[PDB]
């Protein structure tokens, strides 16, 4: 499992923080609450 600030990248097969996707313009769905 991951946190509410993390998402699970199936390639790395690990939890990736949302802070890396906040600088994006189309982060995952669960990072809306974080970013």
């Amino acid at each position, epitope marked *: 499992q991951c946190s509410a600030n993390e998402y699970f*990248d*199936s*390639l*790395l*097969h*690990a939890c990736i923080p949302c802070q*890396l*996707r906040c600088s994006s313009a189309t*982060p*995952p769905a669960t990072c809306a609450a974080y970013c």
Partner: antibody
Amino acid sequence: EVQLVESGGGLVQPGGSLRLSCAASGFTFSRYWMSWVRQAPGKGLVWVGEINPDSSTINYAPSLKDKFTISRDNAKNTLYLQMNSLRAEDTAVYYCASLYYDYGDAMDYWGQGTLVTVSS
Amino acid sequence: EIVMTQSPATLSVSPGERATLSCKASQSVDSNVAWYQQKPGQAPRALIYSASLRFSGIPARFSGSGSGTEFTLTISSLQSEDFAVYYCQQYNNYPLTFGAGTKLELKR
């Protein structure tokens, strides 16, 4: 030094079998996912399969389903690839990679790659 | 399987200039596209993993972007060491399907 030395792999005729070893020394082999990928002579990459750390969830590829069995002996820190009923259309170089996300940075380590040529 | 289509198959460019590749997908794979560089003889070398997130030791000139089905990889300024093949990959649906390939050449 992270190292992925891949032994085994030579020449075989259509329908033969072959086991490949991917010895890992230099990183926590027993804690990350492992994957195999082939690339035919002068052609693009072609995924094969991955395997969970504790061998609790293996993922193969449809086209090669039933053809390649994947295993791993964490004790010897090494990844195996059992090949069955091959064909000249299966000829390619076989790498063994490993992608994870520890230390806050995305890593990736590829082996030398060993060639497997199928032909009569 | 899903089809990743890379265009152009070959891009001629000189050091210093930029390069923008493309990787079209058969179906919406969302922000789940990686990028790999491979040189003649050496194994592949990862560059981007979550469409825009780079790997470790990857310079900043390498920039990935795109979501859904249209993806690209920008190389703001080409060094000598950056002229090689560039593949793309999707991991939104097994089997993980690679791209066709975009090989750069040093124009002289």
